[PDB]
């Protein structure tokens, strides 16, 4: 209905300039990205018959 | 109203000495006042601009001598 | 429904001749046109990450 | 205050019709409000810039729909 619409914006270049402890600012970290690398494991289930 | 923009300074309080403080101050400043006089460095703060003052204590276009006393009062040491 | 139709026409040369105070007539200025020229302003917003 | 400038419009009234007038009005306008929307033409005025409001009637940074009603009302026809 256009009431609640969706955006993306930038970072005010006065905030981005001093980010994580420049010019004596504090408690303004940069965001970070890691990579996890977790594993899966499968087993061989048997099967068989007779006559 | 400053009608332009407000630079919002939020200082985080700290323990300076044994049983003492430099208290934190949430304050907004008219941007053309903020560019003229801002003493903020090493104050343990963060700053963002906004079109409307984001904090309770607001210094509009004309305070100056009332703000100039306040910005360097961010170093007031309290007990 | 045709009741109220849409026209465009010109100026009777009795009127057009004397326009804005000729031959003693009054209150009838010519129409005019200007131009305006206003401006827009954009600002670069930063962005950033860490590892 | 507007903190930019004031465009001071001084309108000179005339006799429009039989025992009638188009009222002249001395008015000040915030210079950014004046530049944005001003209807003055053929209104028999004289305009000057100023630092402080030069007339009692003042229109600050934010009026708009109040001023836009006033500048067209320079043509008000009274008995």
UniProtKB/Swiss-Prot annotation, chains A, C:
Signal peptide: none annotated. A proteolytic cleavage by the prohead core protein protease gives rise to the mature major capsid protein during virus maturation. It comes from the Viruses. Belongs to the Tevenvirinae major capsid protein family. Homohexamer. Interacts with the portal protein. Interacts with the capsid vertex protein that forms pentamers. Interacts with hoc; one hoc molecule associates with each capsid hexamer. Interacts with soc; this interaction reinforces the capsid structure. A total of 960 subunits of the major capsid protein forms the 160 hexamers. Major capsid protein that self-associates to form hexamers, building most of the capsid in association with pentons made of the capsid vertex protein and one dodecamer of the portal protein. The major capsid protein self-associates to form 160 hexamers, building most of the T=13 laevo capsid. Folding of major capsid protein requires the assistance of two chaperones, the host chaperone groL acting with the phage encoded gp23-specific chaperone, gp31. The capsid also contains two nonessential outer capsid proteins, Hoc and Soc, which decorate the capsid surface. This is Major capsid protein. It comes from Enterobacteria phage T4 (Bacteriophage T4). The chain holds residues 218 to 268 of 521 of the full protein.
Curated annotation (Swiss-Prot), chains B, D:
Gene3D superfamilies: Small outer capsid protein Soc (3.90.930.20). This is Small outer capsid protein. One of its GO terms (cellular component) is viral capsid, decoration. Pfam families: Soc. It is found in: Virion. Homotrimer. Interacts with the major capsid protein; three soc molecules associate with each interface between the major capsid protein facets. Keywords: Capsid decoration protein, Capsid protein, Virion. It comes from Enterobacteria phage T4 (Bacteriophage T4). Belongs to the Tevenvirinae Soc family. Capsid decoration protein which helps to stabilize the capsid against extremes of pH and temperature. Once maturation and expansion of the capsid has occured, trimers of soc attach the interfaces between the hexamer of the major capsid protein. Acts as a 'glue' between neighboring hexameric capsomers. Dispensable for the head morphogenesis and phage infection. InterPro entries: Soc (IPR031743), Soc_sf (IPR038151). HAMAP family: SOC_T4. It comes from the Viruses.
């Amino acid at each position: 209905a256009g009431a609640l619409v969706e955006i993306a914006e930038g970072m005010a270049t006065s905030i981005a300039e001093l980010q994580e402890g420049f010019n004596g600012s504090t408690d303004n970290p940069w965001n970070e990205m890691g990579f996890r690398i977790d594993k899966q494991v499968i087993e061989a289930k048997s099967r068989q018959l007779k006559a | 109203a400053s009608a332009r923009g407000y630079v919002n300074i939020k200082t985080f309080e700290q323990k300076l000495d044994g049983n003492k403080k430099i208290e934190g101050k949430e304050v907004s400043v008219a941007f053309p006042l903020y560019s003229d006089v801002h003493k903020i460095s090493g104050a343990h703060y963060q700053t963002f601009p906004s079109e409307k003052a984001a904090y309770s204590t607001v210094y509009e276009e004309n305070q100056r001598t009332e703000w100039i006393a306040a910005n360097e009062d961010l170093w007031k040491v309290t007990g």
